[PDB]
């Protein structure tokens, strides 16, 4: 692990997760990237250095801290032309923010265009040093993070649009292909008796996976950084970039249990050990495992969630009972997705920077349709109601700066006013089931903040939203670096084939 102050020097090399040797980006030589950790109320000082030479992958990048709300440094969020221009390669650029009020499992990634699924996506850990859980567990460090990976054999920008399932789920970045069936399996060790935080986080591009681990149920303790009160549960369905953390209890007979990963499209199924790892309790023979796969019974279902500190619901316990409700219209015209007839592409001076310049109206702000002003101050409700004319369901979308309360998820017709569990990351689920997930959360962040769909060939594909939270106070909450400043007229500066 390394952090709060670290440095991280992205680059280009040949890797081979599951077997098969491809070009891919590494952060300090290894991928998945490094393990960041940290504790509640630091200051992290993440030098990115970009050495990047592969224009195909793009020598270009920037870098988002998922889950973190950045208050006071929304220069510092990621999304290259939103919040800054791309750090171009041979330069660096210091992200330096505090994460004074939250705690749990977050991660990291690329934030331009498709080049988090070429490789630049890890984990981020923000330990709290008076956990309320504490006392549920025994162990909790790097060898008890477990990323889920779904891994491409062909690169974003070479191949399909929208590739229609990976080559191979990695966990904790290896695992096999229906082409390499012999590669190395990750193993996590457990000793007999002890109580584990495992912090399942998926660092996927597109997938979700149906996650379990044969002969052993979960505790369920915290949900996209947020704590909930425990839940038994015996397997998890995970969206792309959802986290959570569950108690393991290592109290069943010492032998190799099958921890399993099913992806919802691409090579289903177990069959040679694909889209698994294995679970080993010391005193085990180093062997695959031999246990069978036993029906869910008791799957993790998200009205279940509840925080464990009581978080109130924003506005009156009725629909559109807040000062400013929006409902997102889908669509999808064949290689664009749109919301409210809007498909997003990144304009040519971040959205931030045109704040900064003056900009202050819908009208003022680009790109056109795709920028939405909030009040400050005030209670918000989205509803994003699945459609049939959005193709690639379920769609899980993510909000930045912001937690929120999932009043209503995705599979219950019910609108819980009182104790919903808030999240950043959540599926809109389907429109056979009539759908309509909506949240809320307050505006207490000025700046501009992305509200898109997670799975990273939609974002490219225009499926995306910035709300210009707060105008008039956006530059004076958010002093911006000489550093952040420099980064356009750089960028600004290339030429096609160095971008
Ligand atoms: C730059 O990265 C790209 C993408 O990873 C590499 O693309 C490979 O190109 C070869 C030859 O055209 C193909 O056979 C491979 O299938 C491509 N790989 C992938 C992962 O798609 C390219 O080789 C890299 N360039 C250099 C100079 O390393
Ligand atoms: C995982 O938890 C489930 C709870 O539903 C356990 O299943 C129940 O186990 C008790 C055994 O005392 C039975 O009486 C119930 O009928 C079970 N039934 C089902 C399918 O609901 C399960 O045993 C637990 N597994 C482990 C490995 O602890
Ligand atoms: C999803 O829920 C939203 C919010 O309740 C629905 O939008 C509201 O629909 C009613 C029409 O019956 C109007 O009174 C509101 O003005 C609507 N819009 C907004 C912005 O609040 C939406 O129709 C629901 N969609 C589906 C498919 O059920
Ligand atoms: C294992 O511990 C769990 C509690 O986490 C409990 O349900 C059960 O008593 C234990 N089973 C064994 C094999 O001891
Ligand atoms: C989809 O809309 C985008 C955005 O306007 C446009 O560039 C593209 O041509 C459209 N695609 C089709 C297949 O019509
Ligand atoms: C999108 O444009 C169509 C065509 O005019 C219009 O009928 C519809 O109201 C628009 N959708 C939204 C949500 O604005
Ligand atoms: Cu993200
Ligand atoms: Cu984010
Ligand atoms: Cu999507
Ligand atoms: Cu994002």
Not at 183 to 189: D, G, P, R
Request: charge should be negative.
């Amino acid at each position: 692990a390394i952090g709060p102050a670290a440095s991280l020097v992205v680059a280009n090399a040949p890797v081979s997760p599951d077997g098969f040797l491809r070009d891919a980006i590494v952060v300090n030589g290894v991928f998945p990237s490094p393990l960041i950790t940290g504790k509640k109320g630091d200051r992290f000082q993440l030098n990115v250095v970009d050495t990047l030479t592969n224009h195909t992958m793009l020598k270009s990048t920037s870098i988002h801290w998922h889950g973190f709300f950045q208050a006071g440094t929304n220069w510092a969020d990621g999304p290259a032309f939103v919040n800054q221009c791309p750090i171009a390669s041979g330069h660096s650029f210091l992200y330096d923010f505090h994460v004074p009020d939250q705690a749990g499992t977050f991660w990291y990634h690329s934030h331009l265009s498709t080049q988090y699924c070429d490789g630049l996506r890890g984990p981020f850990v923000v330990y709290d040093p008076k956990d309320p859980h504490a006392s549920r567990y025994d162990v909790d460090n790097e060898s008890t993070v477990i990323t889920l990976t779904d891994w491409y054999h062909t690169a974003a920008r070479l191949g399909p649009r929208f590739p229609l399932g990976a080559d191979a789920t990695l966990i904790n970045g290896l695992g096999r292909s229906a082409s390499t069936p012999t590669a190395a399996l990750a193993v996590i060790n457990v000793q007999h008796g002890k109580r584990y935080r495992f912090r399942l986080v998926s660092i996927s591009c597109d997938p979700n996976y149906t996650f379990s681990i044969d002969g052993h149920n979960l505790t369920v303790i915290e949900v996209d950084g947020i704590n909930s009160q425990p839940l038994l549960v015996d397997s998890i369905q995970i969206f792309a970039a959802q986290r959570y953390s569950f108690v393991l209890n290592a109290n069943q007979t010492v032998g190799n249990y099958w921890i399993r990963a099913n992806p919802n499209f691409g090579t289903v199924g177990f069959a040679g050990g694909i889209n698994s790892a294995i679970l080993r309790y010391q005193g085990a023979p180093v062997a695959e495992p031999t246990t069978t796969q036993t029906t869910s019974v008791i799957p993790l279902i998200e009205t279940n969630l509840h925080p464990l500190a009581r978080m109130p619901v924003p506005g009156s316990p009725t629909p559109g009972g807040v000062d400013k409700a929006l409902n997102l219209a889908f669509n999808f015209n064949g290689t664009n997705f749109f919301i409210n007839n809007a498909s997003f592409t990144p304009p040519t001076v971040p959205v931030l920077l045109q704040i900064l310049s003056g900009a202050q109206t819908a009208q003022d702000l680009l790109p056109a349709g795709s920028v939405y002003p909030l009040p400050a101050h005030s209670t918000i409700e989205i509803t994003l109601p699945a459609t049939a004319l959005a193709p690639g369901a379920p769609h899980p979308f993510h909000l930045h700066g912001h937690a929120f309360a999932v009043v209503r998820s995705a599979g219950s017709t019910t609108y819980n006013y009182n104790d919903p569990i808030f999240r950043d990351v959540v599926s809109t689920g389907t429109p056979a089931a009539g759908d309509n997930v909506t949240i809320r959360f307050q505006t207490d962040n000025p700046g501009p903040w992305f509200l898109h769909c997670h799975i990273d060939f939609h974002l490219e594909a225009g499926f995306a939203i910035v709300f210009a939270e707060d105008v008039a106070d956006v530059k004076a909450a958010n002093p911006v670096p000489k550093a952040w400043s420099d980064l356009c007229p750089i960028y600004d500066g290339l030429s096609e084939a160095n971008q």
